[PDB]
Amino acid sequence: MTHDNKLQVEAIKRGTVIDHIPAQIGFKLLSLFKLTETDQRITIGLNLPSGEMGRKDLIKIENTFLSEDQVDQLALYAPQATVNRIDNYEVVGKSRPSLPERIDNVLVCPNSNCISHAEPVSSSFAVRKRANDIALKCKYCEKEFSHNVVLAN
Template sequence: MTKDNKLQVEAIKNGSVIDHIPAHSGIKVLRLFQLHQTQNRVTIGLNLPSSVQGLKDLIKIENVFIDEELANQLALLAPNATVNRIEDYEVTKKLTLSLPQKVNRVFQCPNSNCITHSEPVDTSFAVIAKNDSIKLKCKYCEKAFSRESVAERR
């Protein structure tokens, strides 16, 4: 078990641990991906000391196994996070994240004239990674926005 957070947040028996979330992004990850909308126990650690990143946030969700598709969506907010699968107290799978091609239903379009604000449609953005910058292009208004400007909206 990690030296980073031993005893900082209790170990879980079964479920998922999202580790190495940038400090101050944990709450946003929780909220945008609705990870707290469950009856299962969720524990979070904020501003935990981390040997690799100074401070980190961490989210543990018991009895829920985060699949690769959702894990990769998390990469938009926490590119260096790892998603651990825990079974009977053991880490049985450790996913490192790669950017998804699309992100649906998570972010709102920053363009106030976009039809997604007036029609009951799911938002959908194509993820465009170019020269270290990540842009999200709205499927409906076709405008491209920086990852930061989309992620910071709510």
Template structure:
């Protein structure tokens, strides 16, 4: 059986690979990746070689930073980032959950001071398996299902 290329290569940019199926569009929206004029290719429900599927995002002329990759770990903990230059992968790395996340998510506790004061939200990663975050300000802990941005 002849293999065929299903997703076109990019000359320069970033590829976010190994995103759980169904999360690709949510990542595009959350990180506002469509707010640029750069070409974006998204693959949904692509075969992985096994019996599972994955999503994939290619963004031309955009380099995903380490900070963005760590934020991405909340959505796609098994993702890998490939940085592309002149059609070659020049750097490849797995996303990792940082010790803390700042300015990305709003605290689900409506009484938290972070909603009424000019401060960036700040959460500590309390549990890495079935991710739980603890708010720096109100000290309440939440599973990721409590954050509407992650649903």
């Protein structure tokens, strides 16, 4: 078991620690992940120094663990982020978000004429790393978009 590396050090017994989250994104995760909904000890660091990574955000939730698809959803929101499963203090499961094949529910098809809007169905797109950015195709209208344009709910 260790303490930390950067200036401010922390320590939790069991839970998840999302580190290396890009600036101005951490708070976005608290929202669209309803992480704040829990009643477990939570710790957030916004605009913390990452050394050569400029600044980062960092979240800590006591006795809580994220669904793979949130790291799968994390792949589109913070690919450089690092989700660490912590137990009896200090890691035991340090993973890195992998680009998925598909995303469900959380996304909204930018195509305004997509039946997915008007009707009671859960969204679903297919993830495909293209030139340099990510592209995702709708399960319904079959249109493909830059994950940059889709991230506008």
